[PDB]
Design a protein around this ligand. Structure first.
Ligand code: 6EU
Lengths: 92, 595, 131, 72
């Protein structure tokens, strides 16, 4: 019940954020190299780890990793603030 | 002699002062001469006398004034002022008011004191430390120190009637000073509101024609606006919801339109709160306010109902630019995909010029307001930044390094889509929490990592000449992408350990701690941000949104003290109370409950 | 409440019966006056009471705090710093800083004749810190 | 309070000085006359000032003050 409640709280919003940034990074790699669909599949399997120039690639990696840390911390503190604001008696 | 004289007045012995008048007749000098004054911060014997009161009185004062009057002193003793930049203009009368003696005040006024004499020293300024600010006039001092009798006396004296219209060097009047001294404590609150109400009634009695709230200071601020500006909560609350059962009911703002069972409809006046007028109260809470409790002001009834109405009227215009900006980001994702691309890229250059002109109009119009706004202007900064990045990438693509700026502008546009999450409640709560946190604490965490990363990158570069490639090898090591050996490995583990099990860890805890401090007040910040949105929208794009409507309905509520009736604009709000039968019915103006 | 009442009564009685002698000046074998000793062990309430004393008695010379002048809500208080200044050898501040062994030293820091003095010295020496 | 403590540590260390001594350090405060003792000789002490703002002052009347006017 808590899992479904927190999913209904956060999932759609965080998914829209991640989809917006994913299409951004995908079209970015498409311009950098493969259209946005193929670059989207490649970037999605790149972040999962499945699989001058090195400076640009590392700058994209630094930006994505720290931004993903920002979003992960945001979802963490949002779940914490919601849980602290949550009523905990009425679960019974 | 001056030391003898000061011992006389501190003694307060009249017969000890006898013969000094003949001593002055023989001496043929004046009591205003510098010999009988102290050099630095030149005060007089009279001020020393008034400082030294024997059980509320002092006997030497009237014979001393008679001595100066018989002395042929052109400038009299009483109106003389101090000299110091610390202390200028201070009088005997200021002291007598501070030492709480009506009798000495009556004596000074009966001997031709000044009432408009005002003290402009550094001690009488708000910005300093260990200093007292009350405005500058004596009547203001009587008001601030809750001496109602002295106020009644200074208004009602025959000789020198005080003027409520009068104002100091900063143009502040009595009401402005009462605003300036207000803090959060309960006794201060009760005293200020009682004094404020009594002063309005007395100003009604003495200058009925003048609207006392209307006078602004040098900054063009009326006392309601100044009350808003300094985060003064309680007096502001009381000024909005203000009702007089007096004959002078016209001073009041709240009215009851009709009442029927538990349902009644309240009228509030809205003359200053209207966003139509220049320097609205809403624009001043929004932009010019530097208060920490600016969120706390918004919860009050007319503000809440008005912002709720404006936002519910506004929601389709919000959804309109939501879809427009999403379609623009779609077109730019397409042009980035196909780099059919040429005309799309020309449209993207047009859109970059559009966002550039919009943010240029925003920040070009207001600069000092941008300096005030920098604590929370985080969104329009990112909009101007994305516009500048897109401008640079399009101009350089019209001419080798344009692709990094292009991918930065694309990523920042599709993340700037997050601005429009503020429409719904919980999404706006999460986004505003994230934006307020990232201003507060994320900048500290960013600085700490970079020094250690620079050290470890130069470390590997010296251990195993481009600092960039050194940082490349280091972040490829730390993220796990790519690669004495044992000692170096140990250092890397230690470096990796610290990298994630310290900064990240401590920062997260601090953020959690920070959240608790800001906890249970989020709804107010959410309600606030919508105000910014609606006001902006009210402002419109480069294509303008001028000719915004009024907020209320016009209803002539009673009659003025002047014979003319008083048309006002008013915003009506419903209310349901079940404790009503205990209370007596309020005075009403509309009989039939219809419309 | 016991300690502050008894301490003040003893000071008044010692003023009455041995007027030449200043009782709080006498150190122990470790060489500490009672103010320093109360600082060193981290006893708080008695310390707070010792710093800001007043006496409406004919003998107010025992007391440390005074009032320079008063005007509206503003008033200006004097304090003595005859043992508190870092100028002197084996000061109270050196004892709170180094020689103490108490957990709660931080609560002893935030007191009025300490706090204004620390602020004055800190803002006196900002540029050497930046240097 | 911890931050005030750290500043106190730092200000004591910086007043101690470098390898070159920070000697001739200025005594704080100002010498005044508080009064005379039960001994006929006067009291003379070093002193430091502080400001306060209190709004209960109409409930509880003012204490004795040696300085008449606000000075410096
Ligand atoms: C300090 C600032 C201004 C900032 C500038 C750039 C570098 C930025 O990285 C950050 C921190 C950073 C640095 C390196 C890697 C990741 C994150 O956050 C923003 C800044 C953060 C992101 C994420 O977008 C947001 O800030 C959320 C947001 C959107 C719209 C808003 O109106 C808003 O205000 C409420 C907040 C956008 C970037 O510009 C982007 O897409 C790229 C290229 C990196 C992002 O720095």
């Amino acid at each position: 019940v808590m899992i479904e409640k927190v999913i209904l709280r956060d999932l759609l919003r965080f998914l829209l954020v991640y989809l917006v940034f994913l299409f951004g990074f995908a079209v970015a790699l498409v311009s950098l190299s493969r259209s946005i669909l193929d670059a989207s599949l490649e970037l999605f399997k790149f972040t999962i780890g499945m699989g001058r120039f090195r400076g640009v690639v590392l700058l994209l990696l630094l930006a994505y990793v720290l931004l993903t840390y920002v979003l992960l911390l945001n979802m963490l503190i949002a779940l914490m603030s919601e849980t602290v604001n949550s009523v905990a008696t009425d679960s019974w | 002699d001056r030391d003898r004289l000061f011992n006389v007045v501190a003694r307060g012995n009249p017969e000890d002062l006898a013969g000094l008048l003949e001593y002055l007749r023989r001496t043929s000098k004046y009591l205003t001469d510098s010999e009988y004054t102290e050099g630095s911060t030149g005060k007089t014997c009279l001020m020393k006398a008034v400082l030294n009161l024997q059980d509320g009185v002092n006997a030497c004062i009237q014979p001393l004034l008679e001595i100066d009057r018989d002395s042929g002193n052109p400038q009299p003793l009483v109106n003389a002022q101090c000299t110091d930049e610390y202390y200028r203009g201070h009088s005997a009368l200021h002291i007598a008011i501070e030492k709480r003696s009506l009798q000495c005040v009556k004596l000074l006024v009966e001997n031709g004191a000044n009432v408009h004499a005002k003290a402009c020293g550094h001690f009488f300024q708000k910005n300093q430390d260990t200093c007292f600010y009350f405005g500058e006039l004596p009547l203001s001092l009587a008001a601030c120190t809750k001496q109602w009798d002295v106020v009644n006396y200074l208004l009602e004296n025959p000789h020198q009637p005080a003027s409520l219209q009068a104002q100091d060097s900063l143009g502040n009047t009595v009401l402005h000073a009462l605003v300036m001294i207000a803090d959060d404590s309960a006794e201060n609150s009760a005293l200020v509101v009682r004094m404020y109400d009594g002063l309005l009634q007395a100003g009604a009695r003495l200058c009925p024609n003048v609207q006392l709230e209307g006078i602004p200071n040098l900054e063009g601020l009326t006392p309601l606006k100044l009350a808003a500006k300094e985060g003064k909560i309680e007096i502001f609350k009381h000024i909005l919801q203000r009702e007089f059962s007096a004959p002078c009911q016209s001073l009041s703002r709240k009215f009851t339109e009709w009442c029927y069972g538990p349902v009644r409809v309240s009228l509030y006046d809205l003359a200053s709160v209207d966003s139509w007028e220049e320097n609205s109260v809403l624009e001043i809470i929004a932009f010019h306010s530097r208060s920490p409790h600016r969120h706390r002001m918004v919860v009050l009834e007319p503000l809440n109902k008005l912002l709720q109405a404006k936002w519910d009227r506004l929601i389709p215009r919000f959804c309109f630019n939501f879809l427009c900006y999403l379609v623009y980001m779609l077109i730019f994702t397409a042009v980035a995909y196909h780099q059919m691309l040429l005309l799309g890229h020309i449209l993207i250059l047009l859109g970059g010029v559009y966002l550039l002109l919009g943010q240029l109009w925003y920040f070009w119009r207001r600069r000092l307001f941008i300096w005030i706004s920098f604590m929370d202007s985080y969104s329009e900064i990112l909009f101007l930044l994305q516009a500048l990045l897109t401008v640079l990438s399009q101009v350089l693509c019209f001419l080798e390094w344009y692709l990094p700026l292009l991918v930065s502008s694309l990523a920042m546009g599709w993340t700037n889509l997050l601005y429009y999450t503020r429409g719904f409640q919980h999404t706006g709560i999460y986004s505003v929490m994230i934006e307020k946190v990232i201003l507060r604490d994320l900048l500290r965490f960013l600085l700490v990592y970079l020094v250690f990363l620079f050290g470890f990158a130069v470390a590997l570069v010296s251990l195993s000449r481009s600092i960039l490639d050194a940082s490349l090898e280091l972040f490829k090591f730390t993220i796990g992408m790519g690669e004495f050996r044992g000692v170096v490995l140990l250092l890397l583990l230690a470096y990796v350990l610290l990298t994630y099990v310290l900064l990240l860890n401590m920062l997260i805890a601090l953020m959690s701690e920070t959240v608790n401090s800001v906890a249970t007040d989020s709804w107010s910040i959410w309600k606030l941000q919508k105000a910014i949105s609606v006001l902006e929208m009210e402002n419109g794009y480069w294509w303008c949104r001028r000719k915004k409507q009024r907020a209320g309905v016009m209803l002539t509520v009673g009659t003025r003290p002047d014979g003319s009736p008083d048309e006002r604009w008013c915003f009506r709000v419903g209310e349901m109370n079940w404790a009503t039968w205990e209370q007596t019915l309020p005075r009403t103006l509309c009989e039939e409950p219809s419309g």
